[PDB]
Design a protein around this ligand. Structure first.
Ligand SMILES: [Cl-]
Length: 153
């Protein structure tokens, strides 16, 4: 590869060594345009070095499906810790976002996966997908989704 491509491919793989990340986080961390980041991730995918896993409307870039499963296990443990600590009987994407950004450990963890600082449509969709994976289909479906924590699994 060219100097720019070789260095960037190397950098993306290094960034992923510590865990799966969204393309948005990769772009931000490495100062890449959307197009360059996507093109580079494509090259890595064709080379067998990464896998793209759909996670709602975002894609997670992972070194392996094992790495993905580790990420999911971690995200699930963090959500369940926040639910337990706050004794929650129900949860919604905005409420989960708020618990994450207010808890230093959760905030550090999630911000190493996806931009999380601001309550955007994107992050709400991401957290909604996570909640649905943990608790199944929501009890309240329109406007703000509400999940019953009793429905875990
Ligand atoms: Cl090249």
């Amino acid at each position: 590869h060219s100097r720019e491509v070789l260095v960037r491919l190397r950098d993306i793989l290094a960034l992923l060594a510590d865990g799966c990340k969204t393309t948005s986080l990769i772009q931000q961390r490495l100062g890449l345009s959307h197009g360059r980041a996507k093109a580079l991730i494509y090259v890595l995918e064709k080379e067998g070095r990464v896998t793209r896993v759909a996670f709602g409307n975002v894609a997670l870039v992972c070194l392996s499906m094992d790495q993905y499963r580790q990420l999911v296990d971690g995200m699930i443990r963090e959500v369940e810790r926040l639910v337990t600590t706050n004794k929650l009987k129900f949860i919604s994407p905005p409420r989960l976002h708020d618990l994450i950004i207010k808890d230093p450990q959760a905030r550090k963890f999630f911000s190493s996966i996806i931009p999380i600082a601001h309550r955007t449509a994107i992050i709400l969709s991401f957290l909604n997908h996570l909640l649905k994976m943990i608790y199944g289909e929501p009890y309240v479906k329109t406007d703000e989704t509400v999940y019953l924590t009793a429905n875990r699994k």
